[PDB]
From a paper:
An unexpected homodimeric form of ctMex67 was also observed in which the two copies of ctMex67NTF2L formed a dimer analogous to that in S. cerevisiae NTF2. Two copies of the LRR domain were also present in the asymmetric unit, but the LRR-NTF2L linker was disordered. However, the previously ordered pre-α1 loop that gave rise to the asymmetry in the NTF2L–Mtr2 region was now disordered, perhaps thereby allowing the symmetric homodimeric Mex67 to be generated. Moreover, ctMex67LRR-NTF2L appeared to form a homodimer in solution, and in size-exclusion chromatography coupled with multi-angle light scattering the protein migrated as a single peak with a molecular mass of 82 g mol−1, consistent with a dimer (each chain has a theoretical mass of 42 g mol−1). The homodimeric complex of NTF2L domains in the ctMex67LRR-NTF2L crystals was unanticipated because it had been thought that complex formation between Mex67 and Mtr2 was a prerequisite for efficient nuclear export of mRNA. Although SEC-MALS indicated that ctMex67LRR-NTF2L is homodimeric in solution, whether Mex67 is ever not complexed to Mtr2 in vivo is currently unclear and whether the configuration observed simply represents an inactive form of the Mex67–Mtr2 complex or whether homodimeric Mex67 has another role in the cell has yet to be established.
Residue numbers in the entry: 381 to 556
């Protein structure tokens, strides 16, 4: 199971050494997205994304009830990831915590040009984690859904597969 192998490594790194993930799996073609709500009072990630978008003037005003999405190109991924809260994810060994779906996506082009089509992998992850922001002194449990789109990597890549798209949706944050 490639998804389990990828997610086990991905989330362990995401907790302790996330920036390592970018050179390994991410490239110039990749896009990263975060969906969050402005309404939440004690949400650390929402404030982090909100401040980040404002600083780079990326933010576009919407109704408070309306959901907000922040998407960044390859150059901005590292800086955005830095700002996001520290997280501790439960091991995938605990089946109750994670719901993982892995599906083939045979619509991708072949970078080599050797074959007409290239095999693509789509990974959807439902999980929970412990989000802590020390500077704010905010601690809580997060509910999230994350979607990965995997395709064949470009030449000189560390790994055979790369992340074409990464979409993170922040649903609920429970204090203490």
């Amino acid at each position: 199971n490639v998804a389990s192998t990828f997610l086990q490594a991905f989330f362990q790194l995401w907790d302790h050494d996330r920036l390592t993930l970018i050179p390994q799996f991410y490239d110039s073609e990749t896009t990263f997205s975060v969906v969050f709500a402005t309404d939440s009072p004690q949400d650390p990630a929402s404030s982090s994304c909100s401040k980040f978008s404002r600083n780079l003037n990326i933010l576009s005003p919407r109704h408070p009830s309306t959901l907000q999405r922040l998407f960044v190109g390859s150059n901005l991924i590292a800086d955005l990831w830095k700002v996001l809260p520290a997280t501790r994810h439960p091991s995938l060994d605990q089946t109750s915590q994670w719901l993982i779906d892995c599906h083939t996506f045979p619509h991708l082009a072949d970078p080599t040009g050797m074959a007409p089509y290239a095999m693509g992998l789509m990974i959807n992850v439902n999980g929970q984690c412990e989000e802590a922001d020390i500077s704010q002194n905010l601690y809580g449990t997060r509910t999230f859904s994350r979607c990965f789109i995997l395709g064949p990597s470009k030449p000189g890549a560390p790994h055979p597969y790369r992340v074409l798209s990464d979409q993170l949706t922040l649903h609920t944050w429970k204090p203490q």
